[PDB]
């Protein structure tokens, strides 16, 4: 059985690679969710900072409109 032997070897080869590949995709995905988690924490900070700035410019400007 020559052909049968060859087909079975490509199926084994595909299935070994496909399996390792899937482990690699999992860690890629878990990487993504970690990055979003972190970037989430950054955006809450920028937001606080930008809102704090917004006020402190307006506060300064009220000093300027007097003089």
């Amino acid at each position: 059985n020559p052909h049968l032997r060859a087909y079975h070897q490509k199926i084994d080869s595909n299935l070994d690679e496909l399996s390792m590949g899937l482990g690699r995709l999992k860690d890629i995905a878990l990487g993504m969710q970690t990055e979003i988690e972190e970037q989430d924490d950054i955006l809450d900070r920028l937001t606080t900072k930008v809102d704090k700035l917004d006020v402190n410019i307006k506060s300064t400007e009220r000093k300027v409109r007097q003089l």
Partner: protein
């Protein structure tokens, strides 16, 4: 037989689809990221010029 391969191949298609949908959204957000970066950068030249003119003012008098 070759139908449970056919389901594996389907799952891999839907996964591939999920990965594309994810990059499309990550892409579609560069727009928001860069506008954010712009406004703050624009705001910065104003504070600079504002402080600068507040120096011109404090000297000129």
């Amino acid at each position: 037989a070759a139908e449970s391969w056919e389901t594996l191949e389907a799952d891999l298609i839907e996964l591939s689809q999920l990965v594309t949908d994810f990059s499309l959204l990550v892409n579609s957000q560069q727009e928001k990221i860069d506008s954010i970066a712009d406004h703050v950068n624009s705001a910065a030249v104003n504070v600079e010029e504002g402080t600068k003119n507040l120096g011109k003012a404090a000297k000129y008098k």
